[model samples]
Target: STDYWQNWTDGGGIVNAVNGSGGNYSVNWSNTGNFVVGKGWTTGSPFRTINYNAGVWAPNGNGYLTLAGWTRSPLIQYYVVDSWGTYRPTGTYKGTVKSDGGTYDIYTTTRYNAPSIDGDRTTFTQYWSVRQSKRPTGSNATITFTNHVNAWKSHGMNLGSNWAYQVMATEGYQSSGSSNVTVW
Candidate 1:
């Protein structure tokens, strides 16, 4: 399976994303306002285990390597952040949970009338679980999405019924970064 691309926002036109022969992808960007790239199925699952390896994790500003996606029904955007740049994300402080051999801080916030996977002008909930410890490059990260999902639900982070293409994604905002990732 090759990499898929339905969720993308290359506002700076400087994002260099390449879909490899298999379900693996790589990207590099410089001074990009906002960018997201990944691969996943059209439908989502309440439980999933994603494996990914990134040879490089470099970001000059606010960025994160995560399992990022959008959901219907409730029109919510979710992020299970594993690696990140210099800046850290903070939210309503819903609580913390342990999953996939690491601890994550759960948070929820509102994004009012901003761009989303389903529409341009839409207000949506931003569900987040940022890892307390960042994973290093060139290592296998076994992201047990089921654990995060349960945690989010426990804290009332409503996941959608009609799930979109949830994926192992790399995102950056008004920053510079480059990453080479392989997923299966």
Candidate 2:
């Protein structure tokens, strides 16, 4: 992944945009240190900018990925649904989604074989891993990100509907677009 190609996920540069098309993508050869296959979406998602180590990818955290990464407790809020099976009307609504305050893991697998999108296609298994934040209403929202490598298929990595997770919050919903959507 180019140093400037900033991704808020652990496995950086998993998907690289190819030709500005959604399904096409490339991989970062330095981080994962290997090229892999994958797919992308053609819906004209946002493009990821490249950065060099000194001018791009850098350690911002005080821990693993950074030496001075700062932590801020974001006021968290979500909707409270009646039940898992009950449908919450779309078109964003405002409400405190009750949560159990716990940690959860989400796993997804590829349904077909796709081309490698990164450095050396022999490295990764062409998959995605994410830790989701549970909604105050107990249900969580879908987290979207970019993958440069062609390793991912168009709409490939299917996060099963049963996939669920949790996170912490310190506030209530004030309005829509109040939260910066990203996964740590």
Candidate 3:
């Protein structure tokens, strides 16, 4: 005995893994176990296409192994190409500080109050408190760009085509006071 149902269209297609051949009555669905049919592709079609209409519609052409949509986050920029993720600053351009028409050189000394945790015991009572450093010897460098630009990677190892920052100025100065400031 044989069973049959009315031909109907499926919303999507099934995944098939068989090579259909004609003039093969010995070839049965049960024997093959590899028949996929629906709105997508037949069991042995060379190409297939699908258009999904959900909250957001998307169409995938045939022969695409694995396709994924682009994703971008506010804090980070990420793009997928050839099934790989690339992250960088999110802007088309990056310019120098002097391009805005200023000397772009400023020297100012500042102090940083560093705090550290300290613990002590007195007569079996333990006490923990934050200890502020009287003097910390160090300085910070700030860069003001002329325009908003994408962030760039900077490292001694990434020396070749990936380096971005240019040397604007370089100097060695001594600090002058109670906060390690001799001002050179």
Candidate 4:
């Protein structure tokens, strides 16, 4: 229930899923100026994730595009919406609206029965982050972060009838000396 197809130098990236469906992904970086693409799932109990990233770092770094993790049950709801890209995020969020290609903000957290969901489930920590306010260079808009399940159901977070475990990626930081990324 995992996949492959990778490329990285001072950083690394590649993932493909076969038995779990949702396949064909790509990632590449040379120097790694702080990075993250997206995808995480641990094979059990509400441990899910989605991520897109840029760079400039803080609150961990890279900018943002995350759908958080851990929620097989036990009180944890979801919703997200941001259809395009450009970069716009400051802080302090539980709800921020505006649709059609830009603007989105919502965050939630609760961990009592924690075990996976970005702590072990593939490798994450918490969840819920859709960020990008600055720090994107070139090369097809620094990778991409499009559609995203129609911006997470236009901010209603339905997840469209429940599908589980998917992963995509692009992560790098410190870069080592220089960095470059290209995908098609």
Clashes of 3: 8
Candidate 3 — worst ten consecutive residues by lDDT sum?
Answer: 175-184
lDDT of 1 by residue, 66-141 (tens): 8887788988888889899987777999999898788999999899878887677888999999988887669887
Cα misplacement distance, residue 175 of candidate 1 (Å):
0.6
Residue 86 miss distance in model 3 (angstroms): 47
Q: Which number leads on lDDT?
A: 1
Residue 31 of model 4, lDDT score? 35
What's the distance in Å from true for residue 33, model 2? Answer: 27
lDDT of 2: 0.21
Residue-level lDDT for 24 in candidate 4 = 27
User: After superposing candidate 1, which stretches have Cα over 4 Å from the reference?
Assistant: 1-3
Which has the better lDDT: candidate 2, or candidate 4?
4
lDDT for 131 in candidate 4 is 37
Name the runs in model 4 displaced over 4 angstroms. Answer: 1-39, 42-86, 89-104, 107-156, 171-184
On residues 14-94, what C-alpha lDDT tens digit does candidate 2 reach at each position? 323122132222222222311212221211121222111111111111111110011112111111121111121232111
| lDDT against true structure, model 4 | 0.33
Question: What are the per-residue Cα lDDT tens digits for candidate 3 across 1-184?
Answer: 1111111112233322222222011101111111211111112111112112111111122211111111111111111111101111122222222312222111111113311111122111111110111111133212222111211221111112221112111101111001111100
Residue 107 in model 2: lDDT: 27
